[model samples]
Target: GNFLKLPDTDCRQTPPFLVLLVTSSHKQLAERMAIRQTWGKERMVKGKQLKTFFLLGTTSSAAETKEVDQESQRHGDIIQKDFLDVYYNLTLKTMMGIEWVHRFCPQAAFVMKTDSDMFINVDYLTELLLKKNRTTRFFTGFLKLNEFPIRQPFSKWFVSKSEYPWDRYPPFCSGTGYVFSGDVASQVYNVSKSVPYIKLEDVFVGLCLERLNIRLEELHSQPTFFPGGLRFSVCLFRRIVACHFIKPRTLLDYWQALENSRGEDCP
Candidate 1:
């Protein structure tokens, strides 16, 4: 029942309608910095203001916990909780973001949960699609349709029958990157309370949406959000919003290229 505490920032003052809750780790300082310089700068990306919050959990190490405290104080964009951040607990991390928007910043128009290891073109995403459509009860991303829960315990994505007894997962989107309208934030937060909890945040979200009858808009055909890192190319940069996993330095390089490559029909 415990969740992260929201910051003191008045939503009226900041008024960031388009929000991105970027889930990050306590130790990913370098990745966070690179995100700041490239895409995390809320005011700089796109023609709109972005409400980006980094999600983190309590570090077991005293020194690292000190680092998290310092980092939050300095950046003023983190939502830290009492839970320990590990692979299995990513669902908690994701839930923190959804909970924050629903509980604290309900006035925002749209909300997205992405990660720190991504090279996201916020401008392209907003200008191209998000800024236009005003659909209610919507969710979209690289959808994994009717995926059966893995029974193998050796695999990284193993799901126990006791945990999830479904034969095929109800078409869930990948957590690598996904977006939902503002209203769904509150809806899912409340729905999550009734539905059973699972470690797969994305799949759990799907369960919530399914319970609520909020259909997942098919974005699998959208060639841009390459599940694996989109092999960065100047041409590929034109139409994509999120280019999967990225390193800090690689992100910088791709960001620079993306910035420069804008407005040109480079043949």
Candidate 2:
């Protein structure tokens, strides 16, 4: 499916050093707005261009379509597609983000696929990680290694034997937030065509990476990405790259605290 809304001009002038592909549901306007006002708002870090765009899928509501169109017109940071936006369609929604980057903004140096509910320390990510690394196929996040797929049919994460013969999943970064080099965008998207689709978005991506023999980059030296809600702390926020499950309202509060604690003693 083609993109319904796209920020065609975002990377036209300057190829961004980091392009954020935030996977958001069609109704998560509040979450998206909060992100824009907070971490997603960073346009530059040490003069390296950074751009963020929310990825969404079509909703059944005509009213929602109108709302989405209006929002896109105003913010110009939305990339929506024709697939129905549902929980089970997360894989498709995620691919929409990858495909958009592979097609529209392939020149970007790095791409971060995160969710609207995430709080990313764009400053730390760009300055600490991206700026230091100049290698290709660089992929990093909270690494999930040697995990087993849920075999129970009743489980939401269940995988049938026919779908996946292997008991253990390949090492893959958590879907809450992951970063990869620009070259990997086309690599994954092209390989995904042959891989069977799975409901677990993160697992599906892992499968593709495994097929391509691209190992997941583990940030073991520092606690970079938190896969669940984290207790707010200035010192902790200063060290992490992404925190998952942050509420829309609390995002600004955390950002404010981070800003206010800039020079506070943290040992």
Candidate 3:
């Protein structure tokens, strides 16, 4: 069946689940199509409706030096060229995801924001969501923090010392893999509307959650690493969803391992 559009009715009737797969526009479209197909096939086999939304960034040639300079001055360091690209792409991409959900899939039960490279076991993710109480407010990839530094290019991130002048970031979630209740899509968008835009999307979003006093539950899942990493057996208790900075070959291996694990699970 084709993926369903966001419905207008109350959230109860059309309680769909969405997966926002954010990808860099620099990647090949064919590769993205293949990954999306894999997700669709896996979801179908598991009898789940995992609606997928692919978000890509469009680059601009007109450089905004003044904006960059102002941001740099605020942070006490010049932003790296690579990091600036990431900063711009993530900001627009994240806002786009929120707007898309609000416009098309308002009744979705949950929305997962994740990268394209990671292997997500839909069955396991769905099971975890099912276990949550109806009143559960938020879910995210949790991180334990001691002290955080804010300096130079990093200060572009609000948590950086240059931005807020804070010595450490409060314990928060990782932006790589996070799930939010459907209601939060618009709420986050609204909050983002009023807040001064920040270069680091993850930390910016985390600060927004902090303002609302949202609690994040950390999932101790499989170690998620992309591109270059040691291959490890998939453990039952550890859930691997979003592996970061993976190479193409590593992604393929990870996918193959997941498929093999599923086969082994059956008789």
Candidate 4:
């Protein structure tokens, strides 16, 4: 199998981790920039020094209406064409990020791929990854097991009965939030090169990882959608990497909370 060539970097120096923020024609760009600004000058990890990069996804002129029309026809009218276009754009954005990693940060230990709406505590995530087996390739917000309607009229991920006759999807992580090791990022991209396209980006990525026999472990986090308010302080004693599905308003509150926590003796 062909793999993207990794660029030369000082691996002994512990290269910085890259945080990719993926979005397509959504107002989330402003919010993502806000988060980037909040900790732009801050060191990558506490005490230790590193760098961070933010990559946002946008739709090009060639990728707008026509692509949606084609996707609508491919999946039938049951799935909204616009939504399928969004997925297609996102997949392309992710692929671009992978290529960027290969070219710019090959020695990076991990790549954190997340949405703009998610609050990621880098200190916590770095700590967790370092404390555990650093070689592990997969982590995510949610994981489901063989769960599927497979096809539904209202779902943007719907497939035709003849096209996909599977009763259930293989266990995979949710699209809202996830992290992948640096090596696995290249491997997943390579595997996807030959696989048939799937409407769901997360599922498609997961399937590609499965083809390489990569393992994914679900990280236990609050997930930002629990009973309490959207923004919550990171527990000093616990290890949590990310909280997903935050609104723009909550992002500001969360950043402030993180700053306040850092000011105190909290982690």
- Going through the candidates in the order shown, the clash numbers are 0, 0, 10, 0
Could you say which candidate leads in lDDT?
A: 2
For candidate 1, write residues 1-267 as lDDT tens digits: 365445657776666657888887778889889988987777735555677778888878999888878877787888877888988999988888888888778777667788788887676677655444655786877778878999999999999999898788887888988888878989999989888889999999988999999987754346656568866787777667787778899999988997787777866
Worst 10 residues of 4 by lDDT: 75-84
Give lDDT per model, in order.
0.79, 0.85, 0.54, 0.55
RMSD of each: 2.1, 1.7, 9.7, 8.6
Question: Considering summed lDDT, which 10 consecutive residues are worst modelled in model 2?
Answer: 126-135
Candidate 1, residue 54: CA error in Å?
Answer: 0.3
Candidate 3, residues 149-169, lDDT tens digits: the string is 456564444344445555665
* Candidates 3 and 4, the one with greater TM-score: 4
TM-score of each prediction: 0.92, 0.94, 0.69, 0.71
TM-score order, best first, reads 2, 1, 4, 3
In candidate 2, the residue pairs with backbone N, CA or C atoms under 3 Å apart (3 or more residues apart, or in different chains) clash, namely: none
Question: lDDT at 200 for candidate 2?
Answer: 83
What tens digits encode model 4's per-residue C-alpha lDDT throughout 47-136? 544444333333345644455344334422111112222554666655655666665556667776655666666676676667556565
Rank by lDDT, highest first. Answer: 2, 1, 4, 3
Better of 1 and 3 by lDDT: 1
Candidate 1 off by > 4 Å:
1-5, 44-47, 130-132, 219-221
